[PDB]
Design a protein around this nucleic acid. Sequence first.
DNA 1: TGGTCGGCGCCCGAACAGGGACTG
DNA 2: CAGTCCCTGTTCGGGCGCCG
Lengths: 554, 413
Amino acid sequence: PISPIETVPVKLKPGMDGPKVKQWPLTEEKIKALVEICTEMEKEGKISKIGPENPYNTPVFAIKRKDSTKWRKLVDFRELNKRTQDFWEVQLGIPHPAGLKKKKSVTVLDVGDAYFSVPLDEDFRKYTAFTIPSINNETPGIRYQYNVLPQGWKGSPAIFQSSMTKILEPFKKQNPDIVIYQYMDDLYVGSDLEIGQHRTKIEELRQHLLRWGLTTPDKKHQKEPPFLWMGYELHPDKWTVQPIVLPEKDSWTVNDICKLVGKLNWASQIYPGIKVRQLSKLLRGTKALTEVIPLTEEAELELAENREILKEPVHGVYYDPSKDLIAEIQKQGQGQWTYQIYQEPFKNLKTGKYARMRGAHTNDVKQLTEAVQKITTESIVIWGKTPKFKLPIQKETWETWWTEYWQATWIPEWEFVNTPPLVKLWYQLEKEPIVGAETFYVDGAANRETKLGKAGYVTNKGRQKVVPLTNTTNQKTELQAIYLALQDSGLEVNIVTDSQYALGIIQAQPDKSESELVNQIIEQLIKKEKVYLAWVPAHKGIGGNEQVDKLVSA
Amino acid sequence: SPIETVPVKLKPGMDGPKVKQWPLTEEKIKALVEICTEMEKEGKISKIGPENPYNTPVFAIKKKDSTKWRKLVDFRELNKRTQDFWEVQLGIPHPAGLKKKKSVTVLDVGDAYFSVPLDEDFRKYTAFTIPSINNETPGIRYQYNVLPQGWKGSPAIFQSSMTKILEPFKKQNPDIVIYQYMDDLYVGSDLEIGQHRTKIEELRQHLLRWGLTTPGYELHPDKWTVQPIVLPEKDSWTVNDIQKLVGKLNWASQIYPGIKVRQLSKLLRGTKALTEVIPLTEEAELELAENREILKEPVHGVYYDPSKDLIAEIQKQGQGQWTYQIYQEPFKNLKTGKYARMRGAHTNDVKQLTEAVQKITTESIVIWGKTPKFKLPIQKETWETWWTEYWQATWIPEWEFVNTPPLVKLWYQ
DNA sequence: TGGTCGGCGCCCGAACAGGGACTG
DNA sequence: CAGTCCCTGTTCGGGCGCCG
Ligand SMILES: C[C@H](Cn1cnc2c(N)ncnc21)OCP(=O)(O)OP(=O)(O)OP(=O)(O)O
Ligand SMILES: [Mg+2]
Ligand SMILES: [Mg+2]
């Protein structure tokens, strides 16, 4: 029914009044059910009629539920919400089946008319005023107001979760050895008791709840393995996600692509190797989520490959705190990666991906660490632990990069897993001039307001060159220039520069960039067996400098 | 019940802290929870709900193989919002007498602020939330009734009382300087460790039978120089070998408007082979030893203006090689130095970087009565991921992250 | 016909920000 | 100094998925 728990105090944003919008028309169907609900709600006390004295009103409606003769009465409190104070959302994320430890007994209860069991503070009620239209379009609609957490109000969620804990508090406190994963009104009760003794504790809990205004009707999973919880299927020794169907269609619109990626992203927690880069990339041109978009080959494929993975059935295991937590990552190409966290080989708890391209000039070791990060954070969130890693990168390639990178980078305890593709720096830079090597003095520039500009070089053995760039810029030149000094040189070269924009990009050993020019500068760098790049201050007349600028300054 | 909970207000038109709690470890939450449990059973904290829209992150950290967890709250975002309450109305006079102290000793006393009922109308700001492993339960919240450790006002409102608690031992040992920052209390003297340490042991017996309770640890930041910006010492110079000392001294010039260029710039006016050897003339060869003198002669343009915030820059060199650039103005380095890994087991990049933020900050306080605004050389996600692991200062400097190539490390290297 | 709320994930664009390079 | 450029990071919001 309705609970004696202490009502939570609620104020309105300084100097604001309640909502006063009218009830935009509703079908003769919805009305039939709203008045069917309200009668029950009013009779029960969850709401009360109100007269002229109440100067507020908000529009309401209803929805149907999955396989339910049941409707969901909602209220369009969009207006009130703005005018309502703001709260501190107490829900910090979501539980993951792969974090549950194996239990001897599991139960799942679901509180009934959840929100409608928790009272709304006496003084705020005035605003929750709404009106139920008449279908014969005559009688002035009936007006009521809430006396319990209304569905669709900005605050009810936080209040319900809050009260719920407060309600469970004593039970929890007196039955410390019993786990109770609560998410809104859904309760998963775990125990290491025998059927008998656990089923008794599951009863005491239920009663306590009822006694505290909370009903646990038979929607209560018992010898229900597989239990339905949080969108999974919880079996005695494995769990899996529920049927996750993708849409098979002819022509794709944008929101279609949104839905696809959405679900696929969701399946990537258990189905290993789902990838979406190409399918998503297909959504850069901001447009109507009704605008039909043409699929690219590189996407048509990854769609079908994915669509395939989703066919073999898969599942995941539960957590064993007495064992180590392992996570291994593999390179899926073009920035993408896939990983799985297991404890016993082949029996992984979870899987996941990483495809964020942080930066414009980075390599695969930068990304590989970007991932080890995500996987720690995440792994802490679920297990409150940090994994031991298995990585496709030489125990050396690493001691190379970090011991040579200007930034402090780190990786937790880890070991090498020779399971190519392997990760490696596609080339190095001599950090000491190369004897007998045409030393090139390179530079270039371009005019601010005009179109073009240019860049070129000169040698120490007598050689001169320059190229007329177009629409370039102060930077697009230094690079465009160091580009020639590569092809126009051989296995061993020594380029010199006064720009930092280019020495910086290149010193990071980047092997992937957004700009086509950069990529060419790398490609070449891989072919050479020795390259050195030193820097010297621009416009300070240094031996070899001025000549180059001149050839270009024009 | 005549207590005296001083009222406090936030700067003009400034809402309170509304920052999200970040992931912790089983070990940290089990502690953070065993703590709050106690803290509440003594009304220092009170469970609170969703209706309170303010929040601050919190966690714990171990200390000195004492295996004693200690809560900690990142009040940074509050201290920035808690009005000049601690600045324009209740400042702290620079006790520069510390810089010189032969042997200083840091001691955390804040474990006492918990005896000073905090203004109720303000408590509502001290809101913080503990989370759950794998998210089994919603966030359990709380509030402060007494004074929150690691808060700006917290040490202020209390110093009035502190001072008086000190007159006995503080008037009987005027030689010693006593400073208070945040939760910590610094005691600078000149006696040798043999007796100087035995004296701090007395400050204790004074403070414990007066309420307070506090469970090498010493310092002498002055008894360690700013390491100068050194140059090479060769007897054969290559083309780049020179072009380096040049470009280096080129920028190392802004820190000394007087530093010679041409004599060493003349040595090359054409496209020369980097490998090529080209020793110097006696003038430029005299410059190397001249411009070389200006690098033992402390810079000139430094004035500690308390009116602005101490920024800081840091560099990662090689094998535990980190460098300091504490300055308030560009090139106007008020103080620099370095930090290397000790003859103990080798740690990693971040573990050090952090220690090399605490040390630089500890000094910063003793030398200026405040903390910097570190420009960091690490990637946010990386920093924000492990930092809390290797920390132990009961305070937290503000900071930002910057990715900038070196060769500009040549100068401190 | 459609229309509500809170949490978290992903991805994209937009809006900032801050440096270094020039120019007035 | 401004007044701009480039360039690169970061934050915020929106759309979708999943949960109640
Ligand atoms: C109100 C709460 C959260 N919730 C669930 N769905 C919604 C929604 N569409 N809008 C707002 N809140 C929503 O629903 C819990 P729920 O279990 O979905 O429904 P109920 O009211 O508890 O009734 P029953 O037990 O018979 O299933
Ligand atoms: Mg329910
Ligand atoms: Mg140039």
